[PDB]
Amino acid sequence: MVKIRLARFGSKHNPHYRIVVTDARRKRDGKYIEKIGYYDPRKTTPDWLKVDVERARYWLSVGAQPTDTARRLLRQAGVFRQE
């Protein structure tokens, strides 16, 4: 099915992913459906994880299935927080 996962965009030893909705079958760094965020593991900048809970929610609602890591990053940004 469609998915919300990471796409490796950094450089060697400088990983910077790109939280994105893609089809389960495409490449990793292949052609995605829509970008919905980004993530810097090495947290080198105060801004190392943006998400856009709105869009993230749009896709979850229509079928997108998130990777384990992606779900983690989405939660950190409170995609599923209902309180």
Site for RNA in 18-47 (CB under 7 A): 23-33, 41-43
| Smallest separation, CB 69 to RNA (Å) | 3
Out of 52, 55, 60, 69, the only residue in the binding site for RNA (CB under 7 A) is 69
Q: Does 15 bind RNA (CB under 7 A)?
A: yes
Q: Where are the alpha helices (DSSP H) in 1-83?
A: 53-61, 68-76
Interatomic CA distance for residues 35 and 13, integer angstroms:
23
| Smallest separation, CB 54 to RNA (Å) | 16
Terminal Cα distance for the chain, rounded: 29
